[PDB]
Write an enzyme that holds these catalytic residues in place. Structure first.
Site, short mmCIF file in Angstrom:
data_model
loop_
_atom_site.label_atom_id
_atom_site.label_comp_id
_atom_site.label_asym_id
_atom_site.label_seq_id
_atom_site.Cartn_x
_atom_site.Cartn_y
_atom_site.Cartn_z
N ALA A 44 -3.86 2.73 -0.87
CA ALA A 44 -3.41 3.68 -1.92
C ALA A 44 -2.90 4.98 -1.30
O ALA A 44 -2.05 5.65 -1.96
CB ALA A 44 -4.54 3.96 -2.90
N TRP A 62 -11.53 6.34 -8.81
CA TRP A 62 -13.01 6.13 -8.75
C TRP A 62 -13.77 7.45 -8.52
O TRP A 62 -14.76 7.72 -9.25
CB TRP A 62 -13.40 5.09 -7.68
N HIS A 124 -3.98 -7.77 -3.51
CA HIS A 124 -4.59 -7.46 -4.84
C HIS A 124 -3.57 -7.65 -5.97
O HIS A 124 -3.88 -7.33 -7.14
CB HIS A 124 -5.24 -6.06 -4.78
N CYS A 135 4.14 -23.97 -12.05
CA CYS A 135 4.96 -24.20 -10.83
C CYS A 135 4.78 -23.09 -9.79
O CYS A 135 5.40 -23.20 -8.72
CB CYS A 135 6.43 -24.40 -11.18
N1 LIG Z 1 -1.00 11.18 2.10
C1 LIG Z 1 -2.05 10.62 2.70
N2 LIG Z 1 -2.03 10.47 4.05
C2 LIG Z 1 -3.09 9.90 4.64
N3 LIG Z 1 -4.20 9.41 4.09
C3 LIG Z 1 -4.16 9.52 2.75
C4 LIG Z 1 -3.16 10.10 2.01
N4 LIG Z 1 -3.48 10.03 0.67
C5 LIG Z 1 -4.64 9.41 0.62
N5 LIG Z 1 -5.12 9.12 1.85
C6 LIG Z 1 -6.28 8.37 2.20
O1 LIG Z 1 -6.01 7.06 1.77
C7 LIG Z 1 -7.28 6.38 1.60
C8 LIG Z 1 -7.18 5.49 0.41
O2 LIG Z 1 -8.42 4.76 0.31
P1 LIG Z 1 -8.83 4.22 -1.11
O3 LIG Z 1 -8.53 5.28 -2.12
O4 LIG Z 1 -10.15 3.56 -1.00
O5 LIG Z 1 -7.70 3.08 -1.36
P2 LIG Z 1 -7.64 1.60 -0.72
O6 LIG Z 1 -6.24 1.05 -0.69
O7 LIG Z 1 -8.32 1.56 0.59
O8 LIG Z 1 -8.45 0.84 -1.83
C9 LIG Z 1 -8.69 -0.59 -1.69
C10 LIG Z 1 -8.82 -1.22 -3.06
O9 LIG Z 1 -9.92 -0.58 -3.77
C11 LIG Z 1 -9.58 -0.45 -5.15
O10 LIG Z 1 -10.56 -1.00 -5.98
C12 LIG Z 1 -8.32 -1.31 -5.34
O11 LIG Z 1 -8.66 -2.65 -5.65
C13 LIG Z 1 -7.62 -1.08 -4.00
O12 LIG Z 1 -6.52 -1.97 -3.70
C14 LIG Z 1 -8.37 7.44 1.46
O13 LIG Z 1 -9.45 7.25 2.36
C15 LIG Z 1 -7.60 8.77 1.57
O14 LIG Z 1 -8.21 9.71 2.40
N1 LIG Z 2 -3.60 4.28 -6.47
C1 LIG Z 2 -3.52 3.39 -7.52
C2 LIG Z 2 -4.18 3.70 -8.70
C3 LIG Z 2 -4.16 2.81 -9.75
CL1 LIG Z 2 -5.05 3.29 -11.16
C4 LIG Z 2 -3.48 1.59 -9.66
S1 LIG Z 2 -3.41 0.40 -10.97
N2 LIG Z 2 -4.82 -0.33 -11.11
O1 LIG Z 2 -3.10 1.08 -12.19
O2 LIG Z 2 -2.51 -0.60 -10.50
C5 LIG Z 2 -2.79 1.31 -8.49
C6 LIG Z 2 -2.82 2.18 -7.41
S2 LIG Z 2 -1.93 1.73 -5.94
N3 LIG Z 2 -0.82 2.85 -5.66
O3 LIG Z 2 -2.87 1.74 -4.85
O4 LIG Z 2 -1.23 0.52 -6.22
ZN LIG Z 3 7.21 -22.72 -13.93
#
Ligand SMILES: Nc1ncnc2c1ncn2[C@@H]1O[C@H](COP(=O)(O)OP(=O)(O)OC[C@H]2O[C@H](O)[C@H](O)[C@@H]2O)[C@@H](O)[C@H]1O
Ligand SMILES: Nc1cc(Cl)c(S(N)(=O)=O)cc1S(N)(=O)=O
Ligand SMILES: [Zn+2]
Ligand SMILES: [Cl-]
EC number: 2.3.1.-
Length: 282
Positions: A44, A62, A124, A135
């Site tokens: 994210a 969160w 995800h 299909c």
């Molecule tokens: N501009 C930036 N530059 C560097 N780091 C950044 C920046 N902005 C944010 N961060 C860091 O970016 C990190 C984002 O960590 P998290 O927010 O946990 O996102 P995930 O992709 O790992 O979440 C995984 C799954 O969890 C969910 O349930 C969904 O299912 C997701 O797909 C942080 O530690 C920030 O410090």
């Molecule tokens: N950061 C973020 C927040 C939300 Cl809330 C959603 S969602 N569940 O609306 O797709 C998706 C993302 S991302 N950029 O990691 O795809």
């Molecule tokens: Zn089909």
């Protein structure tokens, strides 16, 4: 869902001072030059500079939920533009410096940036993507598919099928797509460099894939403002904005960050474009 473990939220940000940040991005450049097979892992954190709040940052979805506050979006998912980091990743694939891209992002921005889908694992799902149950044919829509949790969207397969199209957004209990996870694992395992960008690496198995690179002497770089679950395992941790890191790196590699023409889907990667010759290292 209600009790679902949202992990460590709202940990303090770390900022490498400028001299140390500059040193570590030059070391990243050296590791990219030295590597036969570079895999990038994105979360994210790579979309926050496009106005999409992350999950576990100081103002994460969160984190804010845990403190009784709301996240804030500065864009819709449809009006979101790929960041400098997104466009840098397009270029690194085009010039042959990126073997594979593993993303936890559902925001559809890697696809919409023009990144080739045959080199992308969307672990995800993708909010713009619906898939035919019968299909398994995928449709990349210009608008967000209105449901989540692999539900019927109400549209039917147009394959020369009338199959039920469903969203590709996993809910908490859903298994990851076996094709994407299979290809992500293969890429990570065979990589000699895995670079994590904007992920806290807290989700199994997505967050564990970069560790697989460390098997048979692979290198791990973590780029993140916050600490991550696998910080101890990193050869290199860069605490800085992924856009500042990726722009400095592209400058070191002698590559421009290409223009975004707007939303464009590329199914398959091309042969690599020309790239600068490699510096002398040792
Ligand atoms: N501009 C930036 N530059 C560097 N780091 C950044 C920046 N902005 C944010 N961060 C860091 O970016 C990190 C984002 O960590 P998290 O927010 O946990 O996102 P995930 O992709 O790992 O979440 C995984 C799954 O969890 C969910 O349930 C969904 O299912 C997701 O797909 C942080 O530690 C920030 O410090
Ligand atoms: N950061 C973020 C927040 C939300 Cl809330 C959603 S969602 N569940 O609306 O797709 C998706 C993302 S991302 N950029 O990691 O795809
Ligand atoms: Zn089909
Ligand atoms: Cl939206």
């Amino acid at each position: 869902p209600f009790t679902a473990d949202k992990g460590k939220c709202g940990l303090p940000e770390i900022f490498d001072p400028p001299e140390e940040l500059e040193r570590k991005v030059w070391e990243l450049a050296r590791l990219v030059w030295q590597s036969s097979s570079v895999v990038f892992h994105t979360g994210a954190g790579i979309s926050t500079a496009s106005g999409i709040p992350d999950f576990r940052g100081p103002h994460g979805v969160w984190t804010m939920e845990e403190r009784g506050l709301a996240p804030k979006f500065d864009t819709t998912f449809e009006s979101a533009r790929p960041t400098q980091t997104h466009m840098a990743l397009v270029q690194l694939e085009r010039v042959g410096l990126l073997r594979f891209l593993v993303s936890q992002n559902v925001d559809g921005l890697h696809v919409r940036s023009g990144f080739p889908r045959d080199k992308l694992a969307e672990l995800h799902g993708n909010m713009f993507v619906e898939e035919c149950a019968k299909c398994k044919t995928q449709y990349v829509r210009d608008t967000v598919v209105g449901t989540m949790g692999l539900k019927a969207t109400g549209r039917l397969c147009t394959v020369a099928c009338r199959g039920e199209l469903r969203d590709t957004i996993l809910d908490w209990e859903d298994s990851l797509p076996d094709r994407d996870l299979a290809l992500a694992d293969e890429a990570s395992r065979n990589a000699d460099l895995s670079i994590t960008l904007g992920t806290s690496l807290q989700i199994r198995p997505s967050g564990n894939l970069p560790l697989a690179t460390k098997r048979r002497g692979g290198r791990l770089v973590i780029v993140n403002l916050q600490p991550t679950k696998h910080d101890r395992h990193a050869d290199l941790r860069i605490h800085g904005y992924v856009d500042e890191v990726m722009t400095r790196l592209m400058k070191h590699l002698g590559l421009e960050i290409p223009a975004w023409d707007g939303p464009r889907v590329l199914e398959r990667a091309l042969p690599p474009l020309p790239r600068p010759p490699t510096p002398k290292l040792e």
